[PDB]
RNA sequence: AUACUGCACAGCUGACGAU
DNA sequence: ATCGTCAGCTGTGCAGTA
């Protein structure tokens, strides 16, 4: 089948050639590579001496990277070396069965090897009555990362006390003082950012064994268990100095907001420099039909992981969503909704979150700096795409 | 700021006839495979029920005559398949001879669909298929590559214990590799559900990508010659790449270690051998011992000195787990016993919660490298200025490269060279590959090697694994 | 299992601190 | 043989193929 399409392509390309003269012989079946020999007619007499022509025919179907304006063809270097060592110019044509697209391309014989990657072009490259003699005369954007450089205070506090943490929690909930969440006990040592003796939490610590130590001594070390205890202390501290408009859920380690204003959404406008934080931080959604039944009231929370780099500590932000059906009860089912919202939001929602949180939300003992900024050598050309939501 | 950001370019892939391009699809459609096949015949055998065989023949007949693209939106994402004509991107053709074709009777499928015991039903289906293929192989009607096309009523029992792992483990004694095809790909009319409750059905991508991926896998399995390879630069020393991953036993919790070896051929070729050894387990830990690493390095060096008649100069080892003192000591002892002077040991971590953020509803480009004080954050998935847009939602997670302290090369050169090793695998043809082939090949080898019994044959041929 | 990405859920592993 | 702390690695499955 493909053997006859080449023969009929050669025959009709020759018919186009013989249309205005252009004396073409073709070859025998002994040929390899170059096709037959053709000439150029001059108003009824073969003024042209000789030239070489090669057929290349293909079936119905577009070429490589063909989009309404051009296409591309690649040349084998054996064939290129075959034509480069010759005594006659050669021409290359293409297929004819979609709308008879007889095109001409010529490879030169100038100094320097390499002539492949024939990139064909628009309507000025076709066999027609428009022009026939033209091939017969051969006689960045700076970005940011999601890290937070943390500046430590002056001094922490250490002590020695050997009660179990389960009993200490039960001590601090049944008591009368403030619900301080800055105390981490591990290895029998009481650790805090606030002073234990200047607190109502001194019941679970010895009075005479409270000491004040420098922050920067324990911030850097070679041990990593002390780093884990430091990170747990930082997590307790971040829970402590924010537990007024949120709570804690162990799933995804989320500090989800607590709805006490009787089902009212929260825009939480800040507008730090020009115009920002106009997106709804908390949203309210009702059921499909009945407004007495509430489907889910949703709001987003986060979870911080702390680490170190060259004795400079950092915090991370992984914001998750949280859907509460009716209130403070945990959600019966939230995996499909969380999957759907994560499928919906593009990268700008993460950008909006990192520009609206941990600098302008819950940041108004630990001082939080600006996120680091880096220079990207090549800017992503977002203006060229369709912007498909 | 102490942050140095690099944007590496898309690495080139060397195809046949000294032509290099960044896209495997257009590169194969332009210059063909790197190692040509001397001949024109790839014989295919089909095993399944009657309707699967007829739809397989119809599928081959349809896709041999060109396949249209998905649309004009992002044309490089969906290039049209050119068929097995004179424009074929393989320089060979596939035919299904009638002297070997296994049709599965409905009585046996009815007996398969009636057994309540889960294990032995899948086992007897696998064994029957293996017996049909073995009697196919013993005769004078040997095919180059076999196709197992599965029906719907078998798929409720087989799928709704693995089937691919069992079949590829029990087919390692044959002289040809096999390829599994579901009912949904061959016929666009019917479509199956999955394990959970499903009012709807599964969905697969359009027939342009299916043809490219399936037939590139079929050509590599049939001919045995590699389609493309990483283009080598001029000036660097001889090198040999090793990758290490882990897997499980599917009954216990014990972990094993897998491996894969690569080196450049003396000429125009590549080597993706496996290892005819079943490294055992030493506890459910994602870390291996030191003596087995030494044996791995000696086997690698013996293979290199057998092919090239000389030792190499550089050794690259890629691992999913963090390097330790024992493994480094074993590898270093093996290398200085052999006498190689350039070493590179890199751990790849896929769980790091740090990202590069920017506004504009789109993430950063693929190939973004940030030096995190001696570590490397690499964006092997990201935006692509060849596909038009970034295919996908949310953000692409990055991977962290952590070199050992005995490695000679710096983090930037290692990051660029690992970035050049990603888009090598011949199972796929897209560019969004976030795992380097020393890791992916080891994962494939381990996944096939899960069900292989003791005292069996393990082939170093890679065609029995993908 | 034509393939990959994103997300979700699980199980597992080595140093803590205590019965 | 249990319980918080942190740090990371394999199985199993659903959308969506932008
Ligand atoms: Mg496969």
XYZ file of N, CA and C in Angstrom, chain B residues 1 20 58 109 122 130 157-158 168 179 206 215 219 224 331 341 401 431 456 462:
60
model
N 21.889 38.011 50.713
C 21.297 36.708 50.988
C 22.277 35.601 50.605
N 20.107 15.038 18.456
C 19.728 15.212 19.851
C 18.603 16.228 19.976
N -7.831 -5.390 16.211
C -8.435 -4.148 15.737
C -7.649 -2.932 16.210
N -12.778 -19.498 32.654
C -13.080 -18.190 33.230
C -14.267 -18.267 34.182
N -6.345 -16.421 41.805
C -5.384 -15.616 41.062
C -4.154 -16.445 40.722
N 0.721 -18.784 32.260
C 2.145 -19.103 32.150
C 2.355 -20.408 31.389
N -12.586 -10.557 39.397
C -11.945 -11.483 40.319
C -10.458 -11.200 40.473
N -9.791 -10.826 39.380
C -8.353 -10.580 39.416
C -8.050 -9.295 40.179
N 4.726 -11.373 36.019
C 6.087 -11.056 35.609
C 7.129 -11.817 36.416
N 3.657 -8.057 28.018
C 3.058 -6.761 28.306
C 1.571 -6.950 28.561
N -6.502 10.132 26.249
C -6.935 9.868 24.888
C -5.924 8.984 24.163
N 3.354 1.539 22.533
C 4.148 1.007 21.441
C 5.636 1.282 21.605
N 8.143 -1.789 21.375
C 9.341 -1.823 20.541
C 10.581 -2.162 21.353
N 14.849 -5.348 21.670
C 15.955 -5.468 22.592
C 17.007 -4.390 22.464
N 31.789 0.766 50.475
C 31.961 1.245 49.105
C 33.367 1.799 48.898
N 39.456 6.852 41.761
C 39.765 8.048 42.532
C 38.622 9.049 42.638
N 18.543 16.803 47.476
C 19.765 16.052 47.220
C 20.767 16.350 48.328
N 7.607 14.395 29.796
C 8.758 15.016 30.435
C 8.617 15.166 31.940
N 14.944 -19.889 42.261
C 14.395 -19.626 40.941
C 15.411 -18.851 40.110
N 16.719 -6.235 31.555
C 15.784 -5.239 32.059
C 14.397 -5.370 31.447
